[PDB]
Amino acid sequence: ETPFTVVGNIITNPVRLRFGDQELYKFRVASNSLYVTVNCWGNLARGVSASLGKGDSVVVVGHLYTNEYERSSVEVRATAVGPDLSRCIARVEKVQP
Amino acid sequence: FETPFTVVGNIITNPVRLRFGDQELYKFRVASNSRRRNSLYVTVNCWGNLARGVSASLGKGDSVVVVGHLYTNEYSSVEVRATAVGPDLSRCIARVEK
Amino acid sequence: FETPFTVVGNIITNPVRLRFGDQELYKFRVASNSRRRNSLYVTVNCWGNLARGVSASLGKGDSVVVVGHLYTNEYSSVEVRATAVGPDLSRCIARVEK
Amino acid sequence: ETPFTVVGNIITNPVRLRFGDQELYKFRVASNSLYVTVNCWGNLARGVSASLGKGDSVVVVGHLYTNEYERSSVEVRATAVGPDLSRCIARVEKVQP
Ligand SMILES: [Ca+2]
Ligand SMILES: [Ca+2]
């Protein structure tokens, strides 16, 4: 419940990870400096893996949090991600349910 | 000291293009996808390269992520000067071209 | 999926209290401190403990930080359901009591 | 130019630091989880040192960035800070220029 928006560029090769039913798509974003790891789940992990990659210019919206581990780092739980249409063009396709 | 703003929702009008010598405006109305089991309507203004990307890529009904700065115009209407707009990839797919 | 919002500026009206059985509303208008060498006007609504803190602490002219969620009401007016409000300590001092 | 807002509590004893003409007032904030270091400068460092302390409930607005050093961590360059009047009361005093 700390909302957060970052506009920038994916700077790593995203990675998919599975947890049975569920899917995570993870990547790093740089802003224009801020470096943050973005985590997409579900249908968002889908849209993003199908559409974006390293070097793409991106708009990320979600919630910011700290993740402690064996250091502690700052990450986004994304709720919406899109390509930044100031820097590119997109063909949009809906996914039949 | 501008007021930053983000809205996620859907374009709900047919966007309107306007040219001013060099410059281009593309503007449209956005409704936010709030849920109860509370709505937000705003006019978004895209300029420049952003106007171009958006007119080539999005239209009435499409899901959107809009980032920019919020303004009131007493002319009184609440408007966003967008800095980045994209389709919402939680609700769609995009084939990206530069 | 509410739309979060933050505005920093000044209260520019005398706030208005309204009671509804248990509940209290304190509402007022805010202008944002934008600079040129572009304004934003919004109605802010505080409820509950926030209505109490704000009525005890702030009034017309005071500098404010407002955090909450943004709404349009077609009744059409743009309003904030505030979650946290405070004086802007870049422009003032506050002696805090709980 | 990545804007950011956090509402929470100061959880360390703030510290003042000087650089000649200029003053920094630094403290840690927790949200309701996110931990972030907040940096106030100038008149903001003033208002905040004069008004707040460990345990106070706070509204922080500014810009988020990453700071690299001998690790890298996420910090806020605050532009406005106030006590959260949902959790307290305040007497406001203007500072004659
Ligand atoms: Ca990949
Ligand atoms: Ca101290």
Alpha helices, H only, chain C: 48-57
Mark residue D46 as left, alpha or beta (left: phi above 0; alpha: psi -120 to 50; beta: remaining): alpha
Is D4 in contact with D64 (CB distance < 8 Å)?
yes
Mark residue A42 as left, alpha or beta (left: phi above 0; alpha: psi -120 to 50; beta: remaining): left
C92: nearest CB among D59, D86, D94: D94
What dotted CATH number matches C1-98? 2.40.50.140
What dotted CATH number matches A1-97? 2.40.50.140
Positive or negative, the Cα torsion across B67, B71, B73, B78?
Answer: positive
Residue D56 has phi, psi (to 5 degrees) of: -70, 145
**Cβ contacts of D36 within 8 Å, gap of 6 or more:** A66, A74, D6, D28, D29, D64, D74, D75, D76
Which tokens in the block code for residue D56?
């106070």
Distance between CA A40 and CA A78 in Å, rounded? 5
Mutate to test the interface with C, among D49, D61, D86 (most CBs of C within 10 A): D86
Task: Say whether D59 and C93 touch across the interface (CB within 8 A).
Answer: no
Task: Say whether D80 and C8 touch across the interface (CB within 8 A).
Answer: yes
For residue A35, the chain D residues in CB contact (below 8 A) are 66, 72
Mutate to test the interface with B, among C38, C71, C76 (most CBs of B within 10 A): C38
Mutate to test the interface with C, among D2, D7, D85 (most CBs of C within 10 A): D85
Task: Say whether A61 and B57 touch across the interface (CB within 8 A).
Answer: no
Alpha helices, H only, chain A: 42-51
Domain ranges of chain A: 1-97
- Which residues sit opposite D89 in a β-bridge? C97
Please name the residue of chain B whose CA is at the shortest distance from the CA of residue C66: B3
Residue type, D80: A
D4: nearest CB among A1, A4, A72: A4
Residue C22 Cα, ligand 1 centroid: separation in angstroms? 54
Distance between CA D21 and CA A51 in Å, rounded? 50
Distance between CA A61 and CA A68 in Å, rounded? 22
Please name the residue of chain C whose CA is at the shortest distance from the CA of residue B79: C40
A83: nearest CB among B62, B86, B90: B86
Ligand with minimal distance to A56 CA: 1
3-class secondary-structure state, position A16: strand
Is D31 in contact with A2 (CB distance < 8 Å)?
yes
By a Cβ cutoff of 8 Å, what residues of chain C touch chain B? 1-8, 32-35, 38-42, 69-72, 76, 78
Task: Give the closest residue to D59 by CA, choosing from C46, A73, B38, B39.
Answer: C46
Task: Give the closest residue to B83 by CA, choosing from D76, A84, C42.
Answer: A84
3-class secondary-structure state, position B93: strand
Give the β-pairing of D3-10 and C93-97: unpaired
C15 labelled binding-site residue: yes
B88: nearest CB among A5, A50, A80: A80
Residue type, C42: V
